[PDB]
Every structure is written in C-alpha cells, then in structure tokens.
RNA sequence: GCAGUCAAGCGUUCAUAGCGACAUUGCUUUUUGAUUCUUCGAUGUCGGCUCUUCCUAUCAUACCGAAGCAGAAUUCGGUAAGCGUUGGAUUGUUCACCCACUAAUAGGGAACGUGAGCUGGGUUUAGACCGUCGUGAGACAGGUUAGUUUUACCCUACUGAU
C-alpha cells in the first residue's frame, strides 16, 4: 500500500548511549558494550531528544514496514542486554539415566560435556560463545544457568545445548527426558 | 557367519559352490549334502554362492536315511579341502570335503564327528566344537 | 520417578503441537497455516495425538 | 497404469493414524487400441547372453517428520538414484509360479537399446506325421520333427600412438 511514513521511538536509559553511524549500531553501558551492523534491512534513525532515537521509512510496502519494527525490537532488546543482561534458566528432564552436563576446557573452548544421556555412551560437546558464562542454580538440583551480555549469542547457544540431546529412533511423546528452556529472565534480579 | 555364529572368521578361499556334494561327516545317517545356498553371500550376475571352512549352508541329503530327504536343512563345513591361506602363512588343505547337520540355532543334530575338523570351524561355532573329534 | 512438575514443561515442546496432515510436520499449537511451501501453507492442521 | 480434490461412513468411542463409498480433475506413452503420415528399386522380425548410459512414480542404504509409534516389529510421507537390486528348477519364452540367499531382490527408456556383437530355441518358404474341414487339389493363432543366416581393406565416433 506503499506506506508513505512509519515510526518507532526507542527510548534510551540514562545508563547507557548507543552510537550511530550510518546503519552501523553500537550501545555502551555498564555491562559491557555490543554492536550490530543492520545494512540488510535499509531503515533510517534519527536523533532527536538524547534518550529518544526514532526510525524511519519512507515509501515503504507492507513487507519492508514489517522490517521497521524488527529493527526497533532488536535494538531494544539488546538495549536491556547491555542495561539489564539476560539470564537462561534450563531444567534437566529424564526417567531413569541422570544426566551429567559439565563445562570442560579443551584448548580454550569452553565445551560444555554432556555424560549419560539416555545412557548413550558418545559424549556430546556445545561451544561457549563469547560474552556468554554458564553457571549453577543455587540448592535446585539439575539446573543450569546461562549467563550473557548478548540477546542472540545466548538464545542460540540456548537452543544449542536443548538440540544437542535429541532422542534417535524412538516414541517422542513417551520418552520426555533431554534438556529445556525453563525461565527466560535477566540477569538484574531486581528487574 | 550368520545368526547364532558369534566372533568373526578371517576370509578365506571359496571352494565349495552351490552345487557341490560334500560327504557327511556327523552320525546323522546321513552319506552326502548338496549344497544349494551360502549365508551371507553376495549380489554379482552369475556367480555361484559359495561356501568355505566353518561356514554353515543348508544342503539336501540327496542319498541317505529315508526321511532325511526331499527337505532343506542347515549344515555346518568342517572340511575345504582347497588351499587357503591363515595368518599365521600356511597354505593348507584337506583330504576331502566334510559337513555336519546343524539347526539354524547353530547345535548339531549328530552325536559325533569323524575325521579332522579344522578349527577355522571348532572356534567360529562352540557347538561344533563340543562334539568335534581331531582338531586340525 | 515422574516429577510431573517438569513433565508439562518437557511435553511444552514435544507434544503440545500441531501437525499439518498433507506434509506432517510440527506447528505450533495456534498456528492457523503452514509454514512449509510443499503442503501450500494449508489451511487443516490436526492436533498431535496425545499418549494412549 | 499413476496422482489429486470433495466426502457419507469404517476405524470400540473419532472424517481424514490408516482407509474410504456416490461423484469429479488431471498425468503417463513401457499395455492394448484407433489412424495410416514416412518406408514395399526392399532401414534384417520374438526371445536369451554381453555391455554402457539415462529417468524416476525409492525396493534397500543416508538424514528426518506422523501413528490407534510404551520397546521390537510395522505402516504413511519429505530431500534424495550417489550406490546396490541375485543364484536356480519349468517353459523359446515376454509373462508367470515356486526353491533359496540377501539390506533389497523397484519399475522402466535409449528404432518394443543391442544379429557387418553372438545363438537360432519360437514364429515364418520348401520334406514329413496326426486331428478337424473339403468330393478333391488343399486350409487350420492347431500339435510335432529336420531345416545354408554373408562383407568393413572406407568416413565419422570411441580406444591407444606419432
């Protein structure tokens, strides 16, 4: 329909400042600092208020202002990665073989080991990528924490470690056991 | 090789062809077996089928006891007697070829085993073994 | 041991789906089409069964 | 021959796990038909052995999804031919039916691939026998036996060499 203008207003903490270049998107903050290249989607910014940045689309269809508010999701959500940080909660599920997941440095890899799963004897390693830490829940048995400044690098080292343990050949509804996504948190207790 | 034949036989020279006529070796009343088809054989456009030692084949009785004939029934090689070749750099052969009667199970029908058995045969299948006379 | 505590959440993501039946493949659970383009993204998709 | 759509019902209870009536839309040129266009100064006619490649509507192997998939076994489907699809009794047999192995014994095309590659078992000249028909000479997808199958010293193509 050819859209004549669509808008979208981010909203900046006075924490952090994001930098704008182009279409080359930088934020720095106490956490830490990230940045993304967004040349592929052709979207405009604008400054205007400081804490206020809005883009903008200019004789768009209805494809391309689809791409519009993406833009503004994914620099959102990674504004409260650098603000907030966020923190992947997985439980472990099985019915009779307990299931040992370590974390294991093989020349600088950071290969998380998982042992006994569903009894196999091969053993199953998933990268640590970087700007992401794994940690322990605390007196909860069976639970591990993913720990990361990223929105994208720890969701897909996430769904990494969760297709790692599949089960090959046999009744999905019946056998439940494997590894999954629990609580989808930050790491700012408070928020 | 086959069900029931647990371990593995290092290969050897085929020289018993679907066809062949192998004296009985076991006191099954039995006189002789006519091979008819190999386990675990291959798929190539005219090529018999064919057998070695400690293989297991089924071969009819086509001059025997009565009733151990006009049937198909599993049997177990326990003589070649065609050159073939072991690790340890032997070409050795016997006298004459020698089967024995033998349920897919693996164990023997016979109560007794005349004659040398070679053990390419003895260690492959235990039941053989068992009621097997001069080893090699 | 069962632990249904989890088990909602295992079965969160192995049977509380939807399958398309023309190409058979896993939809989520308010999906109203496919996602494939070898069924068409149909318009019927049948609830996986659940067990027994 | 193959593939859909709709859908009453079967499927204990449930239209689509798997099937599916009454109708209906197409695909295939390996069936058989119909046409008769090319060829009757003539392109050697069935099958079997040997060999190469191609196509897939995948039989097995690779990776997956669905089940009235608890395991095992099975059934339905998706990308896929890369690779592998046999040995024998009977019959000339195409075909077909059995024995057996195997992961499996899937379908096919290339002048119904392939005779100056082979065989001549069959149909197909001439000899002859039996049955039916004919007064007769003779006729029959009838049944059976015996029945010479030629040339590359050319060009291209291919295999090797200067």
Same mark, same amino acid.
């Given at each position: 329909?050819?859209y004549?203008?669509?808008?979208?207003?981010?909203?900046?903490?006075?924490?952090?400042?994001?930098?704008?270049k182009?279409?080359?998107?930088?934020?720095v903050?106490?956490?830490?600092?990230?940045?993304?290249?967004? &040349?592929?989607?052709?979207?405009?910014?604008?400054?205007?208020?400081?804490?206020?940045?809005?883009?903008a689309?200019?004789?768009?269809?209805?494809?391309?202002?689809?791409?519009?508010?993406?833009?503004?999701?994914?620099?959102?959500?990674?504004?409260?990665?650098?603000?907030?940080?966020?923190?992947? &909660?997985?439980?472990?599920?099985?019915?009779?073989?307990?299931?040992?997941?370590?974390?294991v440095? &093989?020349?600088?890899?950071?290969?998380?080991?998982?042992?006994?799963?569903?009894?196999? &004897?091969?053993?199953?390693?998933?990268?640590?990528?970087?700007?992401?830490?794994?940690?322990?829940?605390?007196?909860?048995?069976?639970?591990?924490?993913?720990?990361?400044?990223?929105?994208?690098?720890?969701?897909?080292?996430?769904?990494?470690?969760?297709?790692?343990?599949?089960?090959?050949?046999?009744?999905?509804?019946?056998?439940?056991?494997?590894?999954?996504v629990?609580?989808?948190?930050?790491?700012?207790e408070?928020? | 090789?086959?069900?029931?034949?647990?371990?593995?036989?290092?290969?050897i020279?085929?020289?018993?062809?679907?066809?062949?006529?192998?004296?009985?070796?076991?006191?099954?009343?039995?006189?002789?077996?006519?091979?008819?088809?190999?386990?675990?054989?291959?798929?190539?456009?005219?090529?018999?089928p064919?057998?070695?030692?400690?293989?297991?084949?089924?071969?009819?009785?086509k001059?025997?006891?009565?009733?151990?004939?006009?049937?198909?029934?599993?049997?177990?090689?326990?003589?070649?007697?065609?050159?073939?070749?072991?690790?340890?750099?032997?070409?050795?052969?016997?006298?004459?070829?020698?089967?024995?009667?033998?349920?897919?199970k693996?164990?023997?029908?016979?109560?007794?085993?005349?004659?040398?058995?070679?053990?390419?045969?003895?260690?492959?299948?235990?039941?053989?073994?068992?009621?097997?006379?001069?080893?090699? | 041991?069962?632990?249904?505590?989890?088990?909602?959440?295992?079965?969160?993501?192995?049977?509380?789906?939807?399958?398309?039946?023309?190409?058979?493949?896993?939809?989520?659970?308010?999906?109203?089409?496919?996602?494939?383009?070898?069924?068409?993204?149909?318009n019927?998709?049948?609830?996986?069964?659940?067990?027994?």
């Open positions: 329909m050819k004549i203008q669509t808008e979208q207003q981010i909203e900046v903490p006075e924490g952090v400042t994001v930098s704008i182009s279409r080359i998107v930088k934020v903050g106490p956490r830490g600092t990230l940045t993304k290249n967004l &040349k592929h989607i052709d979207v405009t910014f604008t400054k205007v208020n400081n804490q206020l940045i809005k883009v689309v200019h004789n768009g269809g209805r494809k391309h202002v689809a791409a519009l508010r993406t833009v503004k999701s994914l620099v959102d959500n990674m504004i409260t990665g650098v603000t907030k940080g966020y923190k992947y &909660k997985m439980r472990y599920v099985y019915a009779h073989f307990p299931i040992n997941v370590n974390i440095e &093989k020349d600088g890899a950071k290969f998380i080991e998982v042992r006994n799963f569903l009894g196999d &004897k091969k053993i199953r390693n998933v990268p640590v990528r970087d700007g992401v830490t794994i940690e322990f829940s605390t007196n909860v048995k069976d639970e591990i924490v993913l720990s990361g400044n990223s929105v994208e690098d720890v969701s897909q080292n996430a769904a990494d470690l969760q297709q790692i343990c599949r089960v090959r050949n046999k009744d999905i509804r019946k056998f439940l056991d494997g590894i999954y629990s609580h989808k948190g930050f790491i700012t408070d928020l | 090789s086959g069900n029931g034949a647990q371990g593995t036989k290092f290969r020279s085929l020289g018993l062809p679907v066809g062949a006529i192998m004296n009985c070796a076991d006191n099954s009343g039995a006189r002789n077996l006519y091979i008819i088809a190999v386990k675990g054989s291959g798929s190539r456009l005219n090529r018999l064919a057998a070695s030692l400690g293989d297991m084949v089924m071969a009819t009785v001059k025997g006891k009565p009733e151990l004939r006009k049937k198909v029934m599993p049997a177990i090689v326990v003589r070649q007697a065609k050159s073939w070749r072991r690790r340890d750099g032997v070409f050795l052969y016997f006298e004459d070829n020698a089967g024995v009667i033998a349920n897919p693996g164990e023997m029908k016979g109560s007794a085993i005349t004659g040398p058995v070679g053990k390419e045969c003895a260690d492959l299948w235990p039941r053989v073994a068992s009621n097997s006379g001069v080893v090699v | 041991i069962i632990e249904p505590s989890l088990k909602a959440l295992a079965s969160k993501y192995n049977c509380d789906k939807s399958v398309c039946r023309k190409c058979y493949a896993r939809l989520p659970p308010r999906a109203t089409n496919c996602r494939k383009r070898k069924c068409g993204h149909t019927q998709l049948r609830p996986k069964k659940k067990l027994k």
